[PDB]
Design a binder for this molecule. Sequence first.
Ligand SMILES: C[NH+]1CCN(c2ncc(Oc3cc(C[N@@H+]4CC[C@H](OCC(=O)O)C4)cc(-c4cc(Cl)cc(Cl)c4)n3)cn2)CC1
Ligand SMILES: [Ca+2]
Ligand SMILES: [Ca+2]
Ligand SMILES: [Ca+2]
Ligand SMILES: [Cl-]
Ligand code: NA
Ligand code: NA
Length: 473
Amino acid sequence: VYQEPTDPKFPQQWYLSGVTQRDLNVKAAWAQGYTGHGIVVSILDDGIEKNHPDLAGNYDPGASFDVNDQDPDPQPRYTQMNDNRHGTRCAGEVAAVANNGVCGVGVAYNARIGGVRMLDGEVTDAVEARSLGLNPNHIHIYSASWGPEDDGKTVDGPARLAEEAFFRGVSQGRGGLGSIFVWASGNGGREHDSCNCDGYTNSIYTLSISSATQFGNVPWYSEACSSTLATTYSSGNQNEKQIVTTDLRQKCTESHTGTSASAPLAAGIIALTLEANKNLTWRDMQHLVVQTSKPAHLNANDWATNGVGRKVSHSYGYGLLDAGAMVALAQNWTTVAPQRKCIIDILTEPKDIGKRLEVRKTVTACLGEPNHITRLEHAQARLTLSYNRRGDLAIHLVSPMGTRSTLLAARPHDYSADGFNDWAFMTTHSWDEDPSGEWVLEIENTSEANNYGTLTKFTLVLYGTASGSLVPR
Ligand SMILES: C[NH+]1CCN(c2ncc(Oc3cc(C[N@@H+]4CC[C@H](OCC(=O)O)C4)cc(-c4cc(Cl)cc(Cl)c4)n3)cn2)CC1
Ligand SMILES: [Ca+2]
Ligand SMILES: [Ca+2]
Ligand SMILES: [Ca+2]
Ligand SMILES: [Cl-]
Ligand code: NA
Ligand code: NA
């Protein structure tokens, strides 16, 4: 009975549907009756062309605001160079109207879509907070494709107001179930960037997404890191197809690119999942992504099996999002137990880094206490250290189950002498593992230079629950 979209550019949306099994399995969700009805997604970017022929039908003023000019209208500023087109491109990926003879379709082509015009001007902490905290009892999912500079030498994250907006969002947003913040892991690949240095994607409150090329490869712009959860297809080389979506000036583009095009496809899949079960919390959504993502056909030299039998990669997280599997598992999903937080201060004194430093600690994960964790979700190693050349450091964290997470890879362009000031390096690779036992932190100087520094604090922060495990994969 299900009839696929008839839009002129839908056959060119190879990532939505394809006979070759190299797609996001979105037709399977559409055939099950999930197209995004009743869900509301907002794009945090340079504005949205609300009158675009493929967006007008799903446009929602209630999911929109212009934070740069302080008004409700997020219309982009038109320039001869078409600079403010990215938000319109992202909005079409999520919710371009289907069966209307225009361009292609959104992943959640019946969802309501809005945009926050926030990148066309100075991006301050207050601007970010007003964007992240926009109408949190109406907007279900926020999609953000950018963050701090992808120059491979920046370490930056949300300042106080933005971090408070994430807290308020996941706690009180969406009737207490929590705002779903979807984030692109970054486009700093050619600068050898490591995405744990970007506090927005490295946050536990954001559901971070990386990219795969059409032939299943790690694109030139991709950043590897342990905070990434999953992947969606995006652009690659000039023999590989790209993202087909709505463009500025009521046009259609077949050349939308980067990890900044992967996050909106994930926001659309998350919108279909939320239609299958409106009661999913922000943490339930991250659990569904971990359980249903598919490593198959994604090529990487770092695929590793974690303590619970799941394959995980620093380029792809748990693999490609699978919309059909996400919606099937969401329908009878049991709400996860409240989040526990176990804080373990690992150091009894400062430690010289030198050429290499290994810190081992056997932990009980708050045994006998209400914050006892037997099922890990996110794990953070909050490090404070001084170092003369930050980019020469590579940091790893091995969990008691043997899962080796790269917290920081060498960044050749990072010459900073500022070190890390309580930086919360996060990993999703030990999800569902029992955190009891020996944790090992390894800090190494990857260069031949006589570098020097000291680790002054290592707090291992574990998040999770103490019940409801599945039999390992
Ligand atoms: C072609 N196009 C490409 C996209 N683009 C662009 N423009 C600016 C930009 O920069 C930042 C920087 C930061 C770090 N912030 C900055 C201020 C805070 O520090 C203040 C403090 O310390 O108080 C830390 C955050 C964000 C950010 C982005 C999204 Cl999407 C949503 C949210 Cl919530 C935040 N954007 C990224 N992309 C426009 C041009
Ligand atoms: Ca405006
Ligand atoms: Ca269309
Ligand atoms: Ca980056
Ligand atoms: Cl917390
Ligand atoms: Na994240
Ligand atoms: Na264990």
